[PDB]
Design a binder for this molecule. Structure first.
Ligand SMILES: O=c1[nH]c(=O)n([C@@H]2O[C@H](COP(=O)(O)O)[C@@H](O)[C@H]2O)cc1CO
Ligand SMILES: O=c1[nH]c(=O)n([C@@H]2O[C@H](COP(=O)(O)O)[C@@H](O)[C@H]2O)cc1CO
Lengths: 126, 124
């Protein structure tokens, strides 16, 4: 009944939002098990195992990242429930591939202000 | 003729725009280049991706849309060629480097001056 959760955020794209990712994961742990807590081959394979196990995939999509985009594309194809979180105050324009993938139900993209992330997650998960 | 889908950063940044033009110009010699509001962009691109025979991505500039295209392409069972420049100083995403299997999903490091010769070798 408590969901398994998969979190996505930029790493090699840049760690600008690392503190925010820690806040997101701390809040997700209140609701479920966060599965995400060659060398790169092991990372890919283990992440893909967890992605298929996840009940919800949550991605912070403000910092551009190949790996986050790839995770989202694989997740869509696995028909996962997906929540993407984007901060327009960053001054970026979110990728059309992510904004345009939203169908408002199984794949949602929410624009938000950084201070409100915990409350937003509360509204989505309760 | 073989149908080719090219991927490269746009909203991730257009730093490598000139290089993308060079790649696309060369790809036109080998096949149909399918990729010569946002919902329409996504839907049209996904239609073309589904119709592709080979997906070619320049993965040096980090980009959500390029990563998403590559994830969808894997699930659509497409042949994939990724091109990365170490001269950028970046460490390429583990999700892209680690998705490679050396045959149907290949990731090549390259130097900008050699991109035309690399593509000639890949497309014979
Ligand atoms: O070391 C890593 N570990 C990892 O899980 N990822 C996954 O890939 C996304 C980041 O991708 P990226 O920004 O690095 O390209 C994250 O959401 C992670 O789940 C990537 C890297 C190093 O690449
Ligand atoms: O306006 C657009 N048109 C488009 O085709 N893409 C596709 O998505 C990738 C770039 O993604 P991105 O850098 O913007 O996130 C490219 O390979 C394109 O095929 C994206 C945008 C604007 O998003």
């Amino acid at each position: 009944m408590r969901p398994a959760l998969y979190f996505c955020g930029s790493i090699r794209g840049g760690r600008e939002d690392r503190t925010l990712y820690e806040r997101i994961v701390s809040r997700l742990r209140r609701f479920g098990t966060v599965l995400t807590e060659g060398g790169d081959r092991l990372i890919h394979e283990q992440d893909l195992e967890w992605l298929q196990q996840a009940d919800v995939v949550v991605a912070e999509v403000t910092q551009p990242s190949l790996g986050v985009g790839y995770e989202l594309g694989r997740a869509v194809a696995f028909n996962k429930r997906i929540l993407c979180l984007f901060r327009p105050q960053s001054g970026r324009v979110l990728s059309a591939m992510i904004r345009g993938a939203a169908d408002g139900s199984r794949f949602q993209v929410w624009d938000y202000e950084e201070g409100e992330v915990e409350a937003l997650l509360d509204r989505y998960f309760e």
